[PDB]
Structures are given as structure tokens and as C-alpha cells.
Design a protein around this nucleic acid. Structure first.
Ligand SMILES: *P(=O)(O)OC[C@H]1O[C@@H](n2cnc3c(N)ncnc32)[C@H](O)[C@@H]1O
Length: 627
DNA sequence: GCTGATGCGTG
DNA sequence: GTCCGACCACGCATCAGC
């Protein structure tokens, strides 16, 4: 009986403690109950162990279900390059809940808003055979495949069929998954650790009943932890280089974990998660961490991280940092390929930054202009916003992976085999030096050239390419490394930890000329959970039925509740920015823009100030002219 | 065709 | 101080209802 399944028990037996028989399908209730126990236990090690116990039973009894169970635990539909999206959110899901329960959409919306979790609405109110893990996962991909006119009704029909067959907590987790907020607490890192733990304790490919159910039975605590850690590194190193569960899992099941590296090798065509950098507080922190290792300084470009794959045989593909295929977004980049390599180059993987380039002015354009590029089936002749590629690394070249070579070798191979064209393809502006004064000028020269600052990377000491890692061998020297008193004019309903309260707030400045409150930004960060739930009733007491006449929000997201303008909060932010959405100081710096706060954060209540004593809009413009 | 509502993606 | 999972703003893309 799956309703009593307990993958959080000590001395978990993969066969006897499972809630289904060998050879039959894993029931979705087993996955749901695992999700329940993962959320109950209060330690990450226990959450991994609980998920591992489910995978051990899946490996021992139902190997062909391992892939769906992994994808359901990750709330994904397949490999990232395939670009499958459900096309459903809270809107489509609430329509299905209202139809499945025969209730009005408004009453279902209000209940979902009050509880901040659509999964609770679908569960608390709802014969068909029990749901299976592979069955539910197949329905998820069916919903994703439906597009075009009248496709919403077809999606809701599949969703409705899921809710009628749900039992116990199944409907809460199907609803949360379909909405894109499963909130399991485990993701790629933990799910991979659970997988390696499972196949280590209960090896795959055994004849039923498995003679080996717990390979760590006799080990001491320290030896067991060390052995699991070492096995986890084998799976995570191979996955970093071939992040495709559709390729990894069949080979893992047929040849085991320790033989898995000999079958999966890095090659062009499969996107990789790029190497990332850690922020630094200044140049002195950079030299302290790098000590004496020689490093290089490159411009910190403001564009899209673009991984360019050239397969042996001419095929070129462009991937995003999240491993989505963007080849169709960049027809201009494809046509540029023969102009950027010597004829001797036949295959590679480039690490570049695609930056919007004003071809008439020969200048770099900010990231916002880049987002206005079309995404859907782009024609090169219709491209309005050209791009210049700024290449700075080389992962693969002519059949050989370079990830283990030092950056000085990879940089050299990049310069020796690829050719530069102005405003199209160039190497990142770089400086090799140790002089603190010289570095400081390069950073100022960088922001003058319309960049965010400097990236600093070691050349030979700890200078390998670390896939899917925010490394400490790369450092950011960012320009952004203001305090304002704003009025709270609206509240947004909260989800997750803020389910029974407010999740965000709409802030506004004071316009002296018109005596109006002008929306300036949304705020939801900087609060402690205590000072939010303790003072929630104070703000709820200010709810109005209608917006006050002097409150002006223009294109901002209309609040879930208008609040009586009375609360003034001290708010900090990184910088200000021109915004086409917010009306604060709309005609003071630009003719039709307006100023908003980038990354605002709550600091303190200002109960001594009234709304008309807030930071004026004129003061917002004055701060923008300086920044 | 038009439009308000609704969904996706990354830096 | 480090690691990890969740979240998001603002751009474009999609679609019901008429
Ligand atoms: P900031 O904290 O805004 O980071 C900018 C992102 O862009 C990537 N990036 C820009 N320029 C480079 C160079 N020259 N080399 C490597 N990466 C770069 C950063 O990795 C940040 O993700």
C-alpha cells in the first residue's frame, strides 16, 4: 500500500520496504510520499538519503522507471537542449482545478491566493486506476507538445484527468510541479548525489532478488561517507561533461558507475554549463586570494553567455548558459563562422559573450537593447540589433578537449586558430599585469568602454576550465560592488514561506510638483521572516478597496491589495535605471522613461515620516544624474 | 484582426 | 565563508474570446 510508504525509515530495504512488486510500474504515490518525507526531515543529508532510498527501490524493482522518476524529482521534461515547456502556469492550472471541482474560477482563485499554494486547492477538494510515475511524466510531455489554437482546452483536459485519478497528496505535487514551483528543496546537485548513493548501495543489473542491497553494510561511518563521496564525484564529473540524463542513465544501468566514464566523453553538440566567477570586494581581495599566481584581467561584458559548438562535419550550434539551443536566434552568428577560424579548424567549443553592437557608431550597446532581438525563427536580413562576439575561452579544438589544460594554453590555442574581425568577432580586451595601479586604471578604462568592470582569471595555477562551477579561480571586479525613503502603496500576495501573508510590496516616491505618489519599484527582499509575519497585521489594516486618486503606477503590476499610503520605509539599492514601466520622475531625465531602483532591499521602517516626507521625485532624478 | 491575459528565459 | 535551491524583471512569444 503506497500510502504508508516510508523512504525516510532507518534500515531501509530496497525490496521489502518498497510499496510495489518487482517488474511492475512505480506508482506516483511512491514519488509523492518521498516528496513528503523529503520536506519533513530537517537536514540536507537526510533529504538526499530519503530520495536515494526511492531510487534504490526503483533500481532493484523497476529499472526502466529510473529516468521518469529522476525527471519528476527535478521537475523537468527532458534534456535542456530539447526546449520542452509545459505552457501552463497558475492561470491554466486554476481553470483546470475549477473545472475538475465544478467550482467558479473566482472562488478557486481566491482560495489559491489566500493559501498561496495551488497544490493545496487541488488536493483539499477533488474508479480510475492508480497513477504511475511513468504515466504522470508522460502526461506532462503530452501537455508540453500541445500548441496552437484551442490548445489550452486540450492541456486542461489532460490536467483534469490527472486530478480525478489523484489520491492522498498526489494532487498537491502534480499542481505544484505543473506551475513550476515544486519547492522540493533538492535540485541537480542533490538529485545527482542521491542517484550515485543509490547505485552504490544497491548496484544495478542484478538478478532478482538482488543479492547486494546494501554494499556499505560493514563499513565504519567515516569509511562509508568517504566512499559515497568519492562515488558521487565520479557521477558528477561525468555528468558535468555529458549533462544528458537520456545518455547517462542507460549507460549507467548497463555498465555501472565506475565504468561510466569510459562510455561518456565530452564532445561538441551537447551543451555544457559554463564556468562562472565569484564576486570580489576590491583589488586587494583579488591579490590576497590569488596570492602569487599570475592572472589576467578581461573586460566584464554585458551580454549573453554564448557557447558555440562546431561539430566535425560543418554543423554549428549555439547554446545558452542554461543549455538551451539558441541557434535559431542567431542566424548572423552562423553565417559568420567561416570568417572566424583558420581552414585547419574543423571542430571546437567556444566560450564567448554576445554583446549588442551599434555598427554605425562602432560602439557597444547595453544588455537591454540585446533583449529586444527576436527569438522565434529569425531571418538575418530582419535583424535590427547586431551582435559582436567577445571570445575568451576554448573548451574543445579539433577532436581534443582542453578543459584540463591551463587557461594560458587554452587562450593561446584560441588566439592561434581564430581570427578577429572588428564589430563581429574579437578576443576579450585583456591585460596581463600585477601592478595594482595598472589594474585600477584598466577597471576604469573598462567602464568607460561601457562594460561592467573586470574579470580576473588565473593563467597557470588552478587554471583549468571547471564546467558547471562558480569557481574561485575567476573573480569579478564589478562597478556596482543609495538610500531612499519610499511609501508603501500596494502589497502582493505571498507564496512558499509567505503563503499566508504578503510576498512583495509596491513602493513609490513623492512628486512635489503634482503632489502625487509615483510607483518606483517592487520590494520583497531584505526582510527577516519574523519582522514580516509580526508586522503583517499592521499593513493588512491599511487595505483599501480602490486606489487613492493621487497614487500613480502607470504600467507597474497592479497590486493584489491597495494599501493606504502611510508606511514609509528606508530602502537601499544598487543603482537607479531608466524604466519604461514606472512613472517616478517620468519627464525629468528622459522624455518618456522614468526611474526605477535596481535590486532594492528593505532596511528600516521610518514611522516618523509621513508619505509627503518621502524621497521626492526630483531627488530621484538628481541621484540618477550622479549615480 | 485585435487585445488583454497568460507563459517562457536569463543575467 | 561556502554551497545549494529558489526566485525574479523585463524583454518577446502565445492564445482565448470576440
Ligand atoms: P556581472 O556580475 O554582471 O557578470 C557578468 C556575466 O558575464 C560573464 N562574462 C562577461 N564577460 C566575461 C569574460 N571576459 N570572461 C568570462 N565571463 C564573462 C560573467 O561570467 C558573468 O556571468
Amino acid at each position: 500500500d503506497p500510502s504508508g510508504y516510508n523512504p525516510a525509515k532507518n534500515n531501509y530495504h530496497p525490496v521489502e520496504d518498497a510499496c510495489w512488486k518487482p517488474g511492475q510500474k512505480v506508482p506516483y504515490l511512491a514519488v509523492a510520499r518521498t516528496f513528503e518525507k523529503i520536506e519533513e526531515v530537517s537536514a540536507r543529508l537526510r533529504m538526499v538519503e530519503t530520495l536515494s532510498n526511492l531510487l534504490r527501490s526503483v533500481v532493484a524493482l523497476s529499472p526502466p522507471d529510473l529516468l521518469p522518476v529522476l525527471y519528476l524529482s527535478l521537475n523537468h521534461l527532458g534534456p535542456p537542449q530539447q526546449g520542452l515547456a509545459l505552457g501552463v502556469g497558475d492561470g491554466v492550472l486554476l481553470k483546470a482545478v475549477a473545472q475538475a471541482t465544478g467550482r467558479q474560477l473566482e472562488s478557486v482563485r481566491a482560495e489559491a491566493a489566500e493559501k498561496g499554494d495551488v497544490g493545496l486547492v487541488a488536493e483539499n477538494s477533488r474508479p480510475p486506476p492508480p497513477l504511475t510515475a511513468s504515466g504522470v511524466f508522460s502526461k506532462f510531455r503530452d501537455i508540453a507538445r500541445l500548441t496552437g489554437s484551442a490548445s489550452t482546452a486540450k492541456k486542461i483536459d489532460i490536467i483534469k484527468g490527472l486530478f480525478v485519478a489523484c489520491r492522498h497528496s498526489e494532487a498537491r505535487f502534480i499542481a505544484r510541479s505543473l506551475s513550476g514551483r515544486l519547492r522540493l528543496g533538492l535540485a541537480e546537485q542533490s538529485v545527482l548525489a542521491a542517484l550515485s548513493q543509490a547505485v552504490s548501495l544497491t548496484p544495478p543489473g542484478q538478478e532478482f532478488p538482488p543479492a547486494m542491497v546494501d554494499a556499505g553494510k560493514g563499513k565504519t561511518a567515516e569509511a562509508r561517507k568517504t566512499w559515497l563521496e568519492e562515488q558521487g564525484m565520479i557521477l558528477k564529473q561525468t555528468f558535468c561533461e555529458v549533462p544528458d540524463l537520456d545518455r547517462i542513465i542507460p549507460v549507467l544501468l548497463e555498465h555501472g558507475l565506475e565504468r561510466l566514464p569510459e562510455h561518456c566523453k565530452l564532445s561538441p553538440g551537447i551543451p555544457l554549463k559554463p564556468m562562472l566567477a565569484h564576486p570580489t570586494r576590491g583589488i586587494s581581495e583579488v591579490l590576497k586570494r590569488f596570492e602569487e599566481a599570475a592572472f589576467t584581467c578581461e573586460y566584464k561584458y554585458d551580454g549573453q553567455r554564448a557557447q558555440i559548438h562546431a561539430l566535425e562535419g560543418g554543423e554549428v550550434k549555439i547554446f545558452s548558459r542554461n543549455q538551451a539551443d539558441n541557434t535559431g536566434k542567431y542566424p548572423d552568428i552562423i553565417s559568420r563562422i567561416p570568417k572566424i577560424k583558420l581552414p585547419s579548424v574543423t571542430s571546437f567549443i567556444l566560450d564567448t559573450e554576445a554583446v549588442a553592437w551599434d555598427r554605425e557608431k562602432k560602439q557597444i550597446q547595453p544588455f537591454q537593447v540585446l533583449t529586444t532581438r527576436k527569438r522565434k525563427e529569425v531571418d538575418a536580413s530582419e535583424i535590427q540589433v547586431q551582435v559582436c562576439l567577445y571570445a575568451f575561452d576554448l573548451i574543445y579544438l579539433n577532436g581534443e578537449s582542453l578543459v584540463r589544460e591551463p587557461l594560458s594554453r587554452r587562450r593561446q590555442l584560441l588566439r592561434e586558430n581564430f581570427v578577429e574581425t572588428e564589430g563581429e568577432f574579437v578576443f576579450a580586451t585583456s591585460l596581463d599585469t600585477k601592478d595594482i595601479e595598472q589594474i585600477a586604471e584598466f577597471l576604469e578604462q573598462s567602464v568607460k568602454d561601457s562594460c561592467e568592470g573586470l574579470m580576473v582569471k588565473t593563467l597557470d595555477v588552478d587554471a583549468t576550465y571547471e564546467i558547471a562551477k562558480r569557481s574561485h579561480n575567476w573573480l569579478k571586479l564589478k562597478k556596482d560592488y543609495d538610500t531612499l525613503d519610499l511609501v508603501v502603496i500596494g502589497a502582493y500576495l505571498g507564496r512558499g514561506k509567505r503563503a499566508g501573508r504578503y510576498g512583495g510590496f509596491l513602493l513609490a516616491s513623492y512628486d512635489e510638483d503634482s503632489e502625487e505618489l509615483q510607483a518606483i519599484c517592487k520590494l520583497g527582499t531584505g526582510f527577516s521572516d519574523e519582522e514580516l509575519e509580526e508586522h503583517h497585521q499592521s499593513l493588512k489594516a491599511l487595505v483599501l478597496p480602490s486606489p487613492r486618486p493621487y497614487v500613480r503606477i502607470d504600467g507597474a503590476v497592479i497590486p493584489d491589495h491597495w494599501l493606504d499610503p502611510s508606511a514609509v520605509w528606508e530602502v537601499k539599492c544598487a543603482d537607479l535605471s531608466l524604466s519604461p514601466i514606472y512613472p517616478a520622475a517620468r519627464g525629468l531625465v528622459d522624455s518618456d522613461k522614468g526611474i526605477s531602483l535596481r535590486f532594492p532591499r528593505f532596511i528600516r521602517v521610518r514611522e516618523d515620516k509621513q508619505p509627503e516626507q518621502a524621497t521626492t521625485s526630483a531627488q530621484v532624478a538628481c541621484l540618477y544624474r550622479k549615480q
